[PDB]
RNA sequence: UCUCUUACUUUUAACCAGUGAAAUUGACCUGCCCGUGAAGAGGCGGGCAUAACACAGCAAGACGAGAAGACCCUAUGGAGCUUUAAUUUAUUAAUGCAAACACCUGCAUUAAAAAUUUCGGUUGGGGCG
RNA sequence: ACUGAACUCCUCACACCCAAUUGGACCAAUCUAUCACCCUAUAGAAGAACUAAUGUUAGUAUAAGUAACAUGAAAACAUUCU
RNA sequence: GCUAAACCUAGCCCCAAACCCCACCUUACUACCAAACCUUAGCCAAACCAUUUACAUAAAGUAUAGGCGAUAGAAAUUGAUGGCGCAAUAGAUAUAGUACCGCAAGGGAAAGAAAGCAUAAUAUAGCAAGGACUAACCCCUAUACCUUCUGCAUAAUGAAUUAACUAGAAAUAACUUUGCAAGGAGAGCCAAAGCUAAGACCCCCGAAACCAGACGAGCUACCUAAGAACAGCUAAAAGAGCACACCCGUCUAUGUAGCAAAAUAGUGGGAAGAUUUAUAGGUAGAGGCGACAAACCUACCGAGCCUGGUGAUAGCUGGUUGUCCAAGAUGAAUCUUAGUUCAACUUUAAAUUUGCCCACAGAACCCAAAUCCCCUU
């Protein structure tokens, strides 16, 4: 098994 | 080039902040290998092979080829018809529009290196004209360069100044091996 | 071997060459045959008489030797009776 | 960005002299991030292009998808300001010349998938563009007759030469 | 950047400043004069010089000392100088065998010493060392007040040697009181370690503790502003009144 | 950085400049662009034997479709005006049978004869 | 930004090359 | 730099490393070619040839005394003390072309130059120097500047 | 797109300020000058490599030696890592032997 | 469960409206048969077929997609385990000898516990080399 | 018989069809010196060139407007009902 | 015409110089009750590994040391403010040690001023082009690229695509061009034409690991302290029966980027005990804990995690970026056959003089094709 790794949190809450 | 030192200096992957832990698994990502987020490969990470620290350039030629550099300069000057001798360098007024106007009548270039033996017994009178022009540059003997020769068109010596450039250079024909540094006694050098 | 070393940034020599080669000036090496001091009573006159010789290397044995040694060893030694001093130099040598 | 479609109403023309055909009136409008697909609003747009105005508003009112309201609105403030600014004498002498959609600025954010992986959401946006040129709508193209259709095979037929010789 | 003095150099430029700059300046001497222990778990070469057999020339020999931990209970006693070698072995003494971890302590023997200048009964943790420089010494307190800092490695010695040294300068009466004769006869045998008391309050004190003695010493109640301009006033109307 | 490349526009254009005509992704994309320019330029180059080939391919066609309008074939017209000495080659047979109908017959009547 | 001068103004001569065919002068 | 292998990697083995077999420079006996080497006395040469052409070029003296002091400043020779050089030795090459009355003091002396320089009316005598005392000889003046 | 779209602010370079026209002279300062001062001694720049040159091994070592005490820390201990690196590199990895 | 499956309801489904991912992806203008070929062809040879496009199904192929799969072999690559593999006893436990006059230091020996390190090559499928 | 190559001939021109490796002639852009002062020249330098590392970051595609997700009903929007 | 493209200073890099109110150790930021010091190891090199290696100038890489091997290596003595830097993927990680991630140690950002589509879907046939053509297609020719291989369209590897970034660092000895020349060199060094100076030449990413020091027992294993829960029926003081809550996880189906990085539905085991469970505390990495399953120790435990050594090492895989021309192809040893060294071949430059082909003559007794050798040519 390999864990999952997650993507920072920044790139996807961004707004306009 | 010998005075060069470059100050240029990159961080290699060992340099850049961080990058210790391997960024995920060898196997199982799906993702390409890797082992710090700082080797070349990655955005901020070091430089492969970049500028390392200051570097000097500095090596030396042989002071009789420097020697012969400058003799070589000298020649051209005066073939090209661009050496002027003065009997001295005193000029009627410290005013460097004279100066100007002078080489100007003279068809000399646009750029003067004038030479005078030693530094302190240089003419107030020139030396007032120059210290206010850009073009026209003064400079003693011991200054002398090939440098300095080309890039100004008209090269000016005093008679005072070929006499001790003749010696100097000349020494260097018809000297020995050092046995020590020059700048150490010896029988016959100043 | 060594080729910046790391407290004088200098080239090292690998002294069991030293140990085992002479060099003559001109570049040529000598050696001792191996086996030369080994269970000499099973070897026949001749061959006991080439193994007791001084024998000069290949080129390429030559110019590793001249890597693996640096411009110290390959220097002009002026020795006071040096049974090699004729053979320091080559005479008569066309190409 | 780029902003192009609006400075289009801005660029005036020479007067015309007497002896020259009435140009026809042309009034840009657009409406930006209008928060639909580019991609479905397109299908709106195609229907709408090359319909008179009335006729583009008349389908509009009738049509189920969300983009149809807000081309019916930026339809009803090109009509607006044709009037009012263009000089454009009758309202219903309008056709939709140009109308098209375009990608508008999206935001990213995040779907969370079952196993502790996700996917990225693109909050998509679109822009509405319109032409509307005065005059009726041009007839659409006659579908090609037997009678021309051989006639271009006949011409084809005519063109050839004998290639690769003197 | 770099830093305008050596790292190795910010000691002495600390004592250069502050309080230690106040320290006085014979204390300030002793720490920074520093002489190398007198050799006592090696053997010194006997000369500079030396023919090693190899080649038969005259080279150059140095005696690099051996380094010694001194765990704090030494500080507690009277080691003359000896402590534990933390070292490394050969096992069977060949170096072609494994290299292994080797701690060599000294063998710790509990005395009790009798010092005739402070008149007191002494127990201390010792070594056969100690004892044998002790008798060399000619007695517990002539060691004391001969064996340097270095060489008697102690902070229970050399603060027996300022006590020492205190009492000698001060010809403390304290010693064998009502035994004039006897005193003096001390202070006589004793007389040639004898130096200015205001060294001998100095003698054997870490850096922390001469620090806290001078700031002890330098210490005062700021005097009241009151005092100093009363002072001033009454001068100042002195000197109109005279003019 | 240094040393940056400030070309790449014009090294890349240069290229794709080839490839506008393309298909697909080959004419925008340079990855794929280049692939299919160097392609087209190698079979431009391996063409020119081709072109060689086949016009006298074509010239050899069409000489056999006019000989056989007057009984002739090929080799025996060929065979025949070489035998006669006559060395028009092939390309000028084809030019005449096309445009000299009446010299094409004049010829193929000289080659009959030659071989009669 | 790239330091240097010379592919700037390669750009220019081509826009400019590009605005004469698209736009030519009467 | 090749295909794959240490040679493309960059890691094949150290300088006479020969594969595994015992290195040709290691399986040949240790002799003592060079034991010693480094105190071993060297001599400088000074063929009479090369005095002769001294002598005649003016460079060295003949009307004085002739040491170590007056060939290094004549350029004559060149002594490196550093490099275990313990001075001058003469040598009879150029005997049968010399003519030259000179006193001159070296290190060793072949005895047909001794006999040469003995027929010409001259003296030679061979004298020793250490190597601190062969520095001062050679370069004089740099020993003056130490201030010793 | 990797291309500016306007022209860089132009770039004025005075050949005639006082550093350009004066530059290169003492240069001679030796041999015009009884060799009281060597050339190199007109050299301005770090002190461990006035007059002198090396690759980088070479001048990291020089760094070490001569300003290593008064190097902060962790550039000192970036200064032993890399020479460390150089060792192994320059002794261990090339074409040659 | 099956012979042997059927009917209905819900979910799913499909259409409409809203919102809107993931693996994947050299480019693809992406047919069938036989033959060939790095030995299994959409792409090559010979034939056959062949206007262009959605939508819904299927899972025969794309040696289909997922983890530099599973299994096997290699590396003078790791690591674990066991020992009558090699090397040690630093450390503890015993003793012995000195050393201090129970405790402790040094030196030996024997153990316990461990520690470090290695796993040559070529051949051999039903062996015992 | 003819057809049939990059063989050969013909008109013109020629350094202009191997892997690893090796020799050589040029050279983009950048900086520096000195020029030019227009967008270059001669030189000195160097983080000096990317169709390829399950390369790094960012953008945008494909799969796909697909998989998937969501609001019990009416109403006076008070409320009632299931 | 959309998305976008672009920009220049915010700052940074390398040098030089200079030595730089109140609250808070209790659960920190809470007004106020009776004790420090102690060898680094290991990776790595030795092609394993075990001793060993691996934390001014000149003398000199010399003396010395060394499984005398990899390699290590003196001293006597000598005396010594600037930028051919970066310019927002660069330069500091930095707009900030912030956001965010982690229990913790710890990790640690981003950013400011073309591609993709649409205008305008599509036409028989096919690496998508080329030769062409009056003409887009129709005709004819044409088996993507890279890498790895004896050999790849290969149904072997890599690549959706665009932009930006991303990989040859140096000595010994040569050669070339200068200088001077039996001397050269700005001490030391070399010298039997040498010496001095310059020019040219030695990559990137990737393990599993090992060791040092921290951080972790809010999960889980076990334990300590003091708590709590266990309906109803049957039975009587039960490791009792049935069966709720509760705990578990037998079997089946579903789900398999899922509601879920282990779930759902049903079914099932225990359910007053060796039970379950809240709270706080303890045991820590060659260690703990373990009703031994190599189980568990913060989702990935045959030995945690983080930082550092560390740019570990990799004879292994992958990658290695302008144009053009030229020469260029199949034995020995080796813990060695996935590698290397020598040879052979190959390339360049140089010297001078024979080289290949080659008939006649010639090359063995024992018991065929050909080959070797060389006058001529
Ligand atoms: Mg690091
Ligand atoms: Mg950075
Ligand atoms: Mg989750
Ligand atoms: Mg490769
Ligand atoms: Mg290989
Ligand atoms: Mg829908
Ligand atoms: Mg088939
Ligand atoms: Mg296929
Ligand atoms: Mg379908
Ligand atoms: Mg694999
Ligand atoms: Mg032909
Ligand atoms: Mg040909
Ligand atoms: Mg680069
Ligand atoms: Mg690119
Ligand atoms: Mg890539
Ligand atoms: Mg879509
Ligand atoms: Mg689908
Ligand atoms: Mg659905
Ligand atoms: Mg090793
Ligand atoms: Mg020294
Ligand atoms: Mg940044
Ligand atoms: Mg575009
Ligand atoms: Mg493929
Ligand atoms: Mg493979
Ligand atoms: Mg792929
Ligand atoms: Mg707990
Ligand atoms: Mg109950
Ligand atoms: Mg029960
Ligand atoms: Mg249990
Ligand atoms: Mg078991
Ligand atoms: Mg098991
Ligand atoms: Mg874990
Ligand atoms: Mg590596
Ligand atoms: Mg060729
Ligand atoms: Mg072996
Ligand atoms: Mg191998």
Same mark, same amino acid.
């Given at each position: 098994?390999?864990?999952?790794?997650?993507?920072?949190?920044?790139?996807?809450?961004?707004?306009? | 080039?010998?005075?060069?030192?470059?100050?240029?200096?990159?961080?290699?992957?060992?340099?850049?902040?961080?990058?210790?832990?391997?960024?995920?698994?060898?196997?199982?990502?799906?993702?390409?290998?890797?082992?710090?987020?700082?080797?070349?490969?990655?955005?901020?990470?070091?430089?492969?092979?970049?500028?390392?620290?200051?570097?000097?350039?500095?090596?030396?030629?042989?002071?009789?080829?420097?020697?012969?550099?400058?003799?070589?300069?000298?020649?051209?000057?005066?073939?090209?018809?661009? /050496?002027? =001798?003065?009997?001295?360098?005193?000029?009627?007024?410290?005013?460097?529009?004279?100066?100007?106007?002078?080489?100007?009548?003279?068809?000399?270039?646009?750029?003067?290196?004038?030479?005078?033996?030693?530094?302190?017994?240089?003419?107030?009178?020139?030396?007032?004209?120059?210290?206010?022009?850009?073009?026209?540059?003064?400079?003693?003997?011991?200054?002398?360069?090939?440098?300095?020769?080309?890039?100004?068109?008209?090269?000016?010596?005093?008679?005072?100044?070929?006499?001790?450039?003749?010696?100097?250079?000349?020494?260097?024909?018809?000297?020995?091996?050092?046995?020590?540094?020059?700048?150490?006694?010896?029988?016959?050098?100043? | 071997?060594?080729?910046?070393?790391?407290?004088?940034?200098?080239?090292?020599?690998?002294?069991?060459?030293?140990?085992?080669?002479?060099?003559?000036?001109?570049?040529?090496?000598?050696?001792?045959?191996?086996?030369?001091?080994?269970?000499?009573?099973?070897?026949?006159?001749?061959?006991?008489?080439?193994?007791?010789?001084?024998?000069?290397?290949?080129?390429?044995?030559?110019?590793?030797?001249?890597?693996?040694?640096?411009?110290?060893?390959?220097?002009? +030694?002026?020795?006071?009776?040096?049974?090699?001093?004729?053979?320091?130099?080559?005479?008569?040598?066309?190409? | 960005?780029?902003?192009?479609?609006?400075?289009?109403?801005?660029?005036?023309?020479?007067?015309?002299?007497?002896?020259?055909?009435?140009?026809?009136?042309?009034?840009?409008?657009?409406?930006?991030?209008?928060?639909?697909? !580019?991609?479905?609003?397109?299908?709106?747009?195609?229907?709408?292009?090359?319909?008179?105005?009335?006729?583009?508003?008349?389908?509009?009112?009738?049509?189920?998808?969300?983009?149809?309201?807000?081309?019916?609105?930026?339809?009803?403030?090109? #009509?607006?300001?044709?009037?009012?600014?263009?000089?454009?004498?009758?309202?219903?002498?309008?056709? =939709?010349?140009?109308?098209?959609?375009?990608?508008?600025?999206?935001?990213?954010?995040?779907?969370?998938?079952?196993?502790?992986?996700?996917?990225?959401?693109?909050?998509?946006?679109? *822009?509405?563009?319109?032409?509307?040129?005065?005059?009726? @709508?041009?007839?659409?193209?006659?579908?090609?007759?037997?009678?021309?259709?051989?006639?271009?095979?006949?011409?084809?037929?005519?063109?050839?030469?004998?290639?690769?010789?003197? | 950047?770099?830093?305008?003095?050596?790292?190795?150099?910010?000691?002495?430029?600390?004592?250069?400043?502050?309080?230690?700059?106040?320290?006085?300046?014979?204390?300030?001497?002793?720490?920074?004069?520093?002489?190398?222990?007198?050799?006592?778990?090696?053997?010194?070469?006997?000369?500079?010089?030396?023919?090693?057999?190899?080649?038969?020339?005259?080279?150059?020999?140095?005696?690099?000392?051996?380094?010694?931990?001194?765990?704090?209970?030494?500080?507690?006693?009277?080691?003359?100088?000896?402590?534990?070698?933390?070292?490394?072995?050969?096992?069977?003494?060949?170096?072609?065998?494994? %290299?292994?971890?080797?701690?060599?302590?000294?063998?710790?023997?509990?005395?009790?010493?009798?010092?005739?200048?402070?008149?007191?009964?002494?127990?201390?943790?010792?070594?056969?060392?100690?004892?044998?420089?002790?008798?060399?010494?000619?007695?517990?307190?002539?060691?004391?007040? !001969?064996?340097?800092?270095?060489?008697?490695?102690?902070?229970?010695?050399?603060?027996?040697?300022?006590?020492?040294?205190?009492?000698?300068?001060?010809?403390?009466?304290?010693?064998?009181?009502?035994?004039?004769? &006897?005193?003096?006869?001390?202070?006589?045998?004793?007389?040639?370690?004898?130096?200015?008391?205001?060294?001998?309050?100095?003698?054997? /004190?870490?850096?922390?503790?001469?620090?806290?003695?001078? %700031?002890? /010493?330098?210490?005062?109640?700021?005097?009241?502003?009151?005092?100093?301009?009363?002072?001033?006033?009454?001068?100042?109307?002195? #000197?109109?009144?005279?003019? | 950085?240094?040393?940056?490349?400030?070309?790449?526009?014009?090294?890349?254009?240069?290229? $794709?400049?080839?490839?506008?005509?393309?298909?697909? %992704?080959?004419?925008?994309?340079?990855?794929?662009?280049?692939?299919?320019?160097?392609?087209?330029?190698?079979?431009?180059?391996?063409?020119?034997?081709?072109?060689?080939?086949?016009?006298?391919?074509?010239?050899? +066609?069409? =000489?056999?479709?006019?000989?056989?309008?007057?009984?002739?074939?090929?080799?025996? /017209?060929?065979?025949?005006?070489?035998?006669?000495?006559?060395?028009?080659?092939?390309?000028?047979?084809?030019?005449?049978?096309?445009?000299?109908?009446?010299?094409?017959?004049?010829?193929?009547?000289?080659?009959? &004869?030659?071989?009669? | 930004?790239?330091?240097?001068?010379?592919?700037?103004?390669?750009?220019?001569?081509?826009?400019?090359?590009?605005?004469?065919?698209?736009?030519?002068?009467? | 730099?090749?295909?794959?292998?240490?040679?493309?990697?960059?890691?094949? @083995?150290?300088?006479?490393?020969?594969?595994?077999?015992?290195?040709?420079?290691?399986?040949?006996? !240790?002799?003592?070619?060079?034991?010693?080497?480094?105190?071993? %006395?060297?001599?400088?040469?000074?063929?009479?040839?090369?005095?002769?052409?001294?002598?005649?070029?003016?460079?060295?003296?003949?009307?004085?005394?002739?040491?170590?002091?007056?060939?290094?400043?004549?350029?004559?020779?060149?002594?490196?003390?550093?490099?275990?050089?313990?001075?001058?030795? $003469?040598?009879?090459?150029?005997?049968?072309?010399?003519?030259?009355?000179?006193?001159?003091?070296?290190?060793?002396?072949?005895?047909?130059?001794?006999?040469?320089?003995?027929?010409?009316?001259?003296?030679?005598?061979?004298?020793?120097?250490?190597?601190?005392?062969?520095?001062?000889?050679?370069? @004089?003046? @740099?020993?003056?500047?130490?201030?010793? | 797109?990797?291309?500016?779209?306007?022209?860089?602010?132009?770039?004025?370079?005075?050949?005639?300020?006082?550093?350009?026209?004066?530059?290169?002279?003492?240069? +001679?300062?030796?041999?015009?000058?009884?060799?009281?001062?060597?050339?190199?001694?007109?050299?301005?720049?770090?002190?461990?490599?006035?007059?002198?040159?090396?690759?980088?091994?070479?001048?990291?070592? &020089?760094?070490?030696?001569?300003?290593?005490?008064?190097?902060?820390?962790?550039?000192?201990?970036?200064?032993?890592?890399?020479?460390?690196?150089?060792?192994?590199?320059?002794?261990? *990895?090339?074409?040659?032997?």
């Amino acid at each position: 098994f390999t864990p999952p790794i997650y993507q920072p949190k920044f790139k996807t809450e961004k707004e306009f | 080039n010998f005075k060069r030192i470059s100050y240029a200096k990159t961080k290699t992957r060992a340099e850049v902040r961080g990058g210790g832990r391997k960024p995920w698994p060898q196997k199982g990502t799906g993702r390409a290998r890797h082992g710090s987020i700082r080797s070349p490969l990655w955005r901020g990470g070091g430089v492969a092979h970049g500028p390392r620290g200051p570097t000097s350039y500095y090596y030396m030629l042989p002071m009789k080829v420097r020697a012969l550099g400058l003799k070589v300069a000298l020649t051209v000057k005066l073939a090209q018809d661009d /050496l002027h =001798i003065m009997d001295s360098l005193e000029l009627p007024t410290g005013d460097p529009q004279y100066l100007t106007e002078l080489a100007h009548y003279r068809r000399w270039g646009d750029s003067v290196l004038l030479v005078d033996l030693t530094h302190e017994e240089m003419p107030q009178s020139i030396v007032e004209a120059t210290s206010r022009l850009k073009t026209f540059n003064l400079i003693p003997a011991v200054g002398l360069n090939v440098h300095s020769m080309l890039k100004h068109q008209t090269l000016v010596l005093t008679l005072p100044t070929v006499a001790f450039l003749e010696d100097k250079l000349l020494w260097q024909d018809s000297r020995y091996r050092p046995l020590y540094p020059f700048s150490l006694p010896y029988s016959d050098f100043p | 071997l060594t080729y910046f070393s790391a407290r004088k940034g200098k080239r090292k020599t690998v002294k069991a060459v030293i140990d085992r080669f002479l060099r003559l000036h001109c570049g040529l090496w000598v050696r001792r045959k191996a086996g030369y001091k080994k269970k000499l009573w099973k070897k026949t006159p001749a061959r006991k008489k080439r193994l007791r010789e001084f024998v000069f290397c290949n080129k390429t044995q030559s110019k590793l030797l001249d890597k693996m040694t640096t411009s110290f060893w390959k220097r002009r +030694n002026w020795y006071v009776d040096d049974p090699y001093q004729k053979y320091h130099d080559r005479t008569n040598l066309k190409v | 960005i780029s902003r192009k479609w609006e400075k289009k109403n801005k660029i005036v023309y020479p007067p015309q002299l007497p002896g020259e055909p009435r140009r026809p009136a042309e009034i840009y409008h657009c409406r930006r991030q209008i928060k639909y697909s !580019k991609d479905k609003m397109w299908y709106l747009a195609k229907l709408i292009r090359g319909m008179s105005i009335d006729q583009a508003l008349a389908q509009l009112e009738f049509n189920d998808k969300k983009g149809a309201k807000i081309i019916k609105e930026v339809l009803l403030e090109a #009509q607006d300001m044709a009037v009012r600014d263009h000089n454009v004498e009758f309202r219903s002498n309008l056709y =939709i010349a140009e109308s098209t959609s375009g990608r508008g600025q999206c935001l990213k954010r995040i779907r969370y998938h079952g196993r502790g992986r996700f996917g990225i959401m693109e909050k998509v946006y679109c *822009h509405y563009f319109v032409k509307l040129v005065e005059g009726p @709508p041009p007839p659409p193209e006659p579908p090609k007759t037997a009678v021309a259709h051989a006639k271009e095979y006949i011409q084809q037929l005519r063109s050839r030469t004998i290639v690769h010789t003197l | 950047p770099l830093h305008k003095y050596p790292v190795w150099l910010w000691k002495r430029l600390q004592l250069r400043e502050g309080i230690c700059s106040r320290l006085p300046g014979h204390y300030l001497r002793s720490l920074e004069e520093e002489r190398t222990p007198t050799p006592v778990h090696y053997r010194p070469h006997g000369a500079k010089f030396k023919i090693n057999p190899k080649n038969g020339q005259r080279e150059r020999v140095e005696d690099v000392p051996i380094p010694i931990y001194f765990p704090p209970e030494s500080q507690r006693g009277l080691w003359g100088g000896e402590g534990w070698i933390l070292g490394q072995i050969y096992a069977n003494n060949d170096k072609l065998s494994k %290299r292994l971890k080797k701690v060599w302590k000294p063998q710790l023997f509990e005395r009790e010493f009798y010092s005739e200048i402070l008149d007191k009964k002494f127990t201390v943790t010792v070594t056969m060392r100690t004892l044998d420089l002790i008798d060399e010494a000619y007695g517990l307190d002539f060691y004391i007040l !001969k064996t340097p800092k270095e060489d008697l490695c102690s902070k229970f010695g050399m603060d027996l040697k300022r006590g020492m040294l205190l009492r000698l300068a001060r010809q403390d009466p304290q010693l064998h009181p009502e035994d004039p004769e &006897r005193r003096a006869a001390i202070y006589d045998k004793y007389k040639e370690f004898a130096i200015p008391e205001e060294e001998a309050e100095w003698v054997g /004190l870490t850096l922390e503790e001469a620090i806290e003695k001078q %700031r002890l /010493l330098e210490e005062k109640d700021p005097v009241p502003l009151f005092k100093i301009y009363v002072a001033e006033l009454i001068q100042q109307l002195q #000197q109109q009144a005279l003019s | 950085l240094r040393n940056r490349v400030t070309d790449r526009y014009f090294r890349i254009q240069e290229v $794709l400049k080839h490839a506008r005509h393309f298909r697909g %992704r080959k004419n925008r994309c340079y990855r794929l662009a280049v692939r299919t320019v160097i392609r087209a330029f190698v079979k431009c180059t391996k063409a020119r034997y081709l072109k060689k080939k086949n016009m006298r391919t074509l010239w050899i +066609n069409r =000489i056999t479709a006019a000989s056989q309008e007057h009984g002739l074939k090929y080799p025996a /017209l060929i065979g025949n005006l070489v035998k006669c000495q006559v060395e028009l080659n092939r390309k000028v047979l084809a030019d005449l049978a096309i445009y000299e109908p009446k010299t094409f017959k004049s010829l193929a009547a000289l080659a009959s &004869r030659r071989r009669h | 930004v790239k330091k240097g001068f010379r592919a700037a103004f390669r750009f220019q001569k081509e826009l400019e090359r590009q605005r004469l065919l698209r736009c030519p002068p009467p | 730099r090749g295909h794959k292998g240490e040679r493309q990697r960059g890691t094949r @083995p150290r300088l006479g490393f020969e594969g595994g077999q015992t290195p040709f420079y290691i399986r040949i006996p !240790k002799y003592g070619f060079n034991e010693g080497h480094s105190f071993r %006395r060297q001599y400088k040469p000074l063929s009479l040839n090369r005095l002769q052409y001294l002598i005649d070029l003016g460079r060295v003296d003949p009307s004085q005394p002739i040491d170590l002091t007056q060939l290094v400043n004549g350029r004559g020779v060149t002594i490196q003390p550093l490099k275990r050089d313990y001075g001058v030795q $003469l040598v009879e090459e150029g005997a049968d072309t010399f003519t030259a009355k000179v006193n001159i003091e070296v290190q060793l002396a072949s005895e047909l130059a001794i006999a040469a320089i003995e027929k010409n009316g001259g003296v030679v005598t061979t004298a020793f120097y250490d190597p601190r005392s062969l520095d001062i000889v050679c370069k @004089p003046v @740099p020993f003056f500047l130490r201030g010793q | 797109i990797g291309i500016r779209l306007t022209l860089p602010p132009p770039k004025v370079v005075d050949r005639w300020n006082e550093k350009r026209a004066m530059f290169g002279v003492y240069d +001679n300062i030796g041999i015009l000058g009884n060799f009281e001062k060597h050339p190199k001694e007109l050299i301005r720049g770090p002190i461990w490599l006035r007059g002198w040159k090396g690759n980088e091994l070479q001048r990291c070592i &020089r760094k070490r030696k001569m300003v290593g005490s008064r190097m902060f820390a962790d550039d000192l201990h970036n200064l032993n890592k890399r020479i460390r690196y150089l060792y192994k590199h320059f002794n261990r *990895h090339g074409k040659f032997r």
